[PDB]
Design a protein around this ligand. Structure first.
Ligand SMILES: [Zn+2]
Ligand SMILES: [Zn+2]
Ligand SMILES: [Zn+2]
Ligand SMILES: [Zn+2]
Ligand SMILES: [Zn+2]
Ligand SMILES: [Zn+2]
Lengths: 252, 227, 137, 143, 23, 155, 54, 67
């Protein structure tokens, strides 16, 4: 278990990467940390690190404290503070979700405030106005360096990746749209994965493009608008009703 | 302007201490709703609690929604605003929404208006709240060691977490597609599979009016495959 | 030309942007307001039309024709209570103009709510109006 | 309930300044805002620094200094005060010393201006200057 | 509290002087 | 340690014993001063604390030499103070009862602290433990922000 | 329930009021109460003969 | 005639807060540190404005990089 052992360091701050990405332009902008005098070509790239959770997850300063938030850099798999980190280092569970359930309405499991609206992409941390648990998973074409895999193969690999990080409500790959819709058990979990597999690789050691994983462009894990499909809409409605019955009985 | 309105923070949120010491930065942030300066209040719930609680939204916004300024929940019932609006829509009415305008200028404008939104009109006056509650209440009343199964007859609404937890109770991996319902369950060992089977909407073969069920499965499966 | 839904949405947006822009310069061109409101009516989104009318009203109350147009728009979609409420409000604002009162009266007459027309007439007469009001009554 | 400020270890300040040369993270994002804010008071700081210019008889003048925890500004808090007649005496001595120097020296090398080139940065006080010892100041030798 | 208890317990800190580890 | 001028009175006799000890400290400080480009925030603060703790240790050494050990002469001590090998104020605090141990001066300014009160490091560890037990939790902190102070060790 | 409010003094470098940024904001009128505009006259002879001149 | 009521100086005001500390630094050190500080300030301001094409030289002689 995670609770059996202390959390290992993801990567030592020597191994950590600098804040000077890619020279996308002609000159560096000090107050922005971005580049400038040229926006030729796309910015995004593939994460060097990944949350290998059983090899990494463990105790922290936080697990002593009762810090209610998980380490963004743990999710990214690059936390340079291992056991000395205040933010936690393990997969969110019912106990921890339950623990922070008050605050998590307003903000993420990464302890950062949600907003009125989704960022037009549905790309950034979720809005407070929706309690979404469903991540859109674009850029699979890019995430596998143009590997002509089977849809079954794709969906299975996706399953392997996101099931590892959180309890699944459902997943469904769409051949016609080349993307995923990865509904989660909890919003905290959803948040965690959404960072934990942002800019990651779907590739594996068994695959031949393993050393070219860095060179492509990573998974585009964003948030999902609810489907137009009335097949699931009805289900959603039913769920809402059920939940409402719970709370309403709880009021008295 | 003058600090005329007081902050609108709820109890649960704020924590069970007789006296906390919070700070107020005036004109201290744009809110999370209406992009508009307001007096940001914040406090650690306990002295040694690491998480500060800062007042996300502005007081006008809070009043408007009739909510907490830190929780974003109704100050009465401590529940999500959308959810409470749904509840209100359900009892006594058919339609009660609280539409926030997603355009940066208009949101400000809306915030400025001293007018309660749909659900807020109910929950403000406690009498009406009580009435709503009572109305709601009224409304209420053979083991070959395969380690790998293929489960069928899966209710469309059921989630994988429910399944796996059920299995655990009766005790790993799992694959489900709600289109096909070809629940490609796989156990971490064959001995575990044996244990499970020996321990036994649970239609369960061990591949590696049931007829009509098979047909329904069939067509659905086919459709899934075409997708 | 205007085939699918989303395309219609885009059209609506673009048109709005035009109309909105023209309102921005001349906050007062009630012809422009009422035209815009007509557009809203045409689109069959009533709420937006109402909003437009309200804004227009705010910008210039004294322009009676605007009021009349709003009223009649309300009547159009058989949203009679809204028309009535509005007309009452118009009366409250500008009682000393007659055409509003007459508009109200005809509405009620067509409605065949004869008692209410008597009652209102009593009110109007009580305010020492023009002789015309009395005669019509 | 008051107490004076902490005479901190100047090493701390030095470290802070070193840190805020390679500034390019979301770490010290608000410190950049701090720097911007400090432009208000930079002329004041300049004035103070020029106020405590070490006079030409002071070899290596120390001074007390206030500094932002993020090293966005470095004031020269001490006011440079002097016993007036004593001060006059010192300047007089330097006047005569300088004059003497002028007398004796056949040529007098002036400093080239500006001292450093645009490529050459502001060299660190610890790495270059703090090691090497300063030359003897100007003061006529007294009986 | 006994002052010998504080004497034994201030050597449990794995570091010396002001910075102690205290596990 | 400042820079040797004409106005510097040279070090008296017994300095030759101590030079190499505080030399080490100086060297450490030099090591502790450079762009160790810690992208991280907490670690960056850690470096700063390394300088702070080092300063404390150096000053603490001289204090020990003067007062506890009772070895070095008074004149020498005075000279050291003047040159600022050891912080005088800190020493003074140390001499005073209660602060026998004291990380640094910044941890006992009630003005600087938002709550009008000293650094939590000044709370004796035992007290904190007691508090935690009463509450249910454990020691929430491990070192304050102003300096690397895992307890300030009044006791 | 009872609580102590405080104003923490902030660094006099960072902006005093982080919030305020010169927003353009449209005002809602909030004329929720209606108010009459109420003139007493009825001119026919001079009121109709005049417009031909005016 | 200097006005007397304003007896809250700038340095005094700054001293009052926590965010400043004080040290005994060599005047040359103060200078160099203040050049470094000033340089960082001005560059921060310029970059903030967006115009990264104005290169500050370390000798505070501003000039544009590109045409
Ligand atoms: Zn971490
Ligand atoms: Zn609350
Ligand atoms: Zn607001
Ligand atoms: Zn300290
Ligand atoms: Zn401390
Ligand atoms: Zn301390």
């Amino acid at each position: 278990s995670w609770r059996d052992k202390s959390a290992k360091v993801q990567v030592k701050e020597s191994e950590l990467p600098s804040s000077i990405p890619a020279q996308t332009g002609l000159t560096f902008n000090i107050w922005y940390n971005k580049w400038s005098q040229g926006f030729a070509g796309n910015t995004r790239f593939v994460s060097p690190f990944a949350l290998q959770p059983q090899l990494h997850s463990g105790k922290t300063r936080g697990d002593n404290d009762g810090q209610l938030f998980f380490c963004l850099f743990f999710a990214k798999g690059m936390c340079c503070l291992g056991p000395k980190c205040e933010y936690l280092h393990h997969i969110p569970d019912e106990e921890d979700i339950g623990k922070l359930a008050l605050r998590t309405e307003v903000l993420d499991c990464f302890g950062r405030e949600k907003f009125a609206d989704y960022r037009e992409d549905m790309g950034g941390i979720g809005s407070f106005r929706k309690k979404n648990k469903t991540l859109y998973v674009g850029g699979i074409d890019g995430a596998l360096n143009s590997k002509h895999l089977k849809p079954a193969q794709i969906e299975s690999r996706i399953r392997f990746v996101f099931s590892r990080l959180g309890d699944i409500d459902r997943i469904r790959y769409v051949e016609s749209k080349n993307c995923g819709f990865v509904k989660f058990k909890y919003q905290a979990n959803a948040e965690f994965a959404k960072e934990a597999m942002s800019n990651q690789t779907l590739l594996l050691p068994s695959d031949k493009e393993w050393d070219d994983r860095r060179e492509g462009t990573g998974l585009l894990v964003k948030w999902a608008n609810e489907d137009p499909d009335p097949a699931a809409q009805k289900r959603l409605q039913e769920e809402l009703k059920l939940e409402s019955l719970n709370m309403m009985v709880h009021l008295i | 302007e003058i600090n005329e309105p007081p902050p609108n923070i709820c109890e649960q949120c704020l924590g069970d201490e007789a006296n906390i010491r919070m700070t107020k930065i005036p004109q201290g942030s744009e809110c999370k709703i209406c992009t508009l300066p307001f007096t940001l209040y914040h406090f650690k719930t306990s002295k040694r609690s690491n998480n500060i609680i800062k007042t996300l939204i502005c007081v006008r916004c809070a009043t408007q929604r009739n909510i907490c300024q830190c929780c974003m929940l109704d100050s009465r019932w401590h529940i999500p605003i959308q959810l409470r609006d749904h509840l209100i829509s359900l009892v006594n009415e058919e339609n009660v929404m609280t539409e926030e305008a997603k355009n940066d200028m208009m949101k400000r404008f809306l915030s400025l208006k001293n007018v309660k939104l749909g659900g807020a009109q109910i929950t403000s006056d406690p009498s009406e709240a009580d009435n709503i509650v009572d109305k709601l209440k009224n409304i209420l009343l053979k083991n070959p060691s395969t380690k790998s199964f293929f489960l069928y007859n899966i209710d469309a609404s059921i989630p994988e977490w429910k399944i796996t937890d059920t299995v655990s109770q009766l005790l790993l991996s799992l694959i489900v597609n709600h289109k096909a319902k070809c629940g490609g369950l796989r156990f971490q060992s064959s001995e575990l599979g044996e244990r499970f089977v020996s321990k036994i909407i649970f239609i369960i073969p061990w591949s590696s009016t049931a007829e009509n069920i098979k047909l329904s499965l069939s067509l659905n499966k086919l459709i899934q495959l075409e997708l | 030309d205007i085939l699918d839904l989303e395309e219609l949405r885009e059209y609506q947006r673009r048109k709005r942007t035009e109309y909105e822009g023209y309102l921005k310069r001349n906050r007062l061109d009630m012809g422009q307001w009422i035209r815009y409101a007509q557009f809203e009516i045409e689109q069959h989104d009533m709420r937006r039309a109402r909003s437009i009318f309200e804004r227009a009203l705010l910008v210039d109350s004294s322009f009676i024709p605007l009021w009349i147009r709003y009223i009649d728009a309300e009547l159009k979609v058989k949203c009679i209570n809204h028309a009535r409420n509005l007309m009452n409000r118009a009366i409250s604002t500008l009682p000393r103009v007659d055409k509003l009162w007459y508009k109200y009266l005809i509405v009620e007459e067509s409605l065949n709510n004869v008692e209410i027309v008597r009652s209102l007439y009593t009110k109007w007469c009580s305010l020492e109006p023009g002789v015309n009001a009395w005669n019509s009554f | 309930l008051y107490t004076p400020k902490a005479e901190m270890p100047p090493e701390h300040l030095r470290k802070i300044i070193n840190t805020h040369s390679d500034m390019a993270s979301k770490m010290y994002n608000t410190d950049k805002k701090a720097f911007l804010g400090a432009l208000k008071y930079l002329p004041h700081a300049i004035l103070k620094l020029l106020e405590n210019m070490p006079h030409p008889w002071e070899q290596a003048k120390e001074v007390k200094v206030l500094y932002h925890t993020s090293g966005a500004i470095t004031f020269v808090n001490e006011t440079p005060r002097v016993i007036e007649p004593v001060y006059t005496a010192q300047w007089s001595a330097t006047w005569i010393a300088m004059r003497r120097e002028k007398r004796d020296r056949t040529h007098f090398k002036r400093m080239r201006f500006p001292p450093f080139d645009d490529d050459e940065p502001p060299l660190s006080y610890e790495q270059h200057i703090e090691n090497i010892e300063p030359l003897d100041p100007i003061n006529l030798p007294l009986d | 509290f006994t002052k010998s208890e504080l004497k034994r317990r201030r050597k449990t800190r794995k570091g010396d002087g002001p910075w102690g580890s205290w596990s | 340690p400042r820079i040797k001028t004409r106005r510097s009175k040279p070090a008296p006799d017994g300095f030759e014993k101590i030079k190499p000890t505080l030399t080490d400290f100086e060297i450490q400080l030099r090591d502790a001063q450079k762009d160790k480009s810690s992208k991280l925030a907490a670690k960056s603060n850690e470096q700063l604390w390394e300088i702070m703790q080092l300063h404390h240790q150096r000053s603490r050494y001289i204090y020990t030499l003067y007062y506890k050990r009772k070895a070095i002469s008074k004149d020498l001590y005075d000279w050291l103070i003047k040159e600022k090998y050891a912080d005088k104020l800190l020493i003074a605090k140390w001499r005073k009862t209660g602060y026998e141990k004291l990380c640094c001066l910044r941890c006992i300014q009630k003005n600087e602290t938002n709550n009008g009160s000293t650094c939590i490091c000044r709370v004796p560890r035992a007290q904190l433990e007691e508090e935690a037990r009463k509450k249910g939790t454990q020691v929430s902190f491990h070192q304050c922000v102003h300096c690397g102070c895992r307890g300030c060790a009044s006791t | 329930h009872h609580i102590e409010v405080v104003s923490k003094q902030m660094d006099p470098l960072l902006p005093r009021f982080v919030g305020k940024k010169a927003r353009k904001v449209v005002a809602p009128t909030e004329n929720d109460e209606v108010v009459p505009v109420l003139h007493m006259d009825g001119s026919n002879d001079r009121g109709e003969a005049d417009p031909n001149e005016w | 005639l200097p006005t007397n009521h304003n007896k809250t100086k700038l340095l005094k005001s700054l001293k009052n807060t926590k965010y400043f500390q004080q040290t005994t630094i060599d005047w040359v050190e103060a200078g160099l540190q203040l050049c470094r500080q000033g340089h960082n300030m001005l560059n921060l301001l310029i970059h903030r404005k967006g115009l990264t094409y104005l290169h500050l030289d370390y000798n505070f002689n501003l000039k544009p990089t590109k045409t």
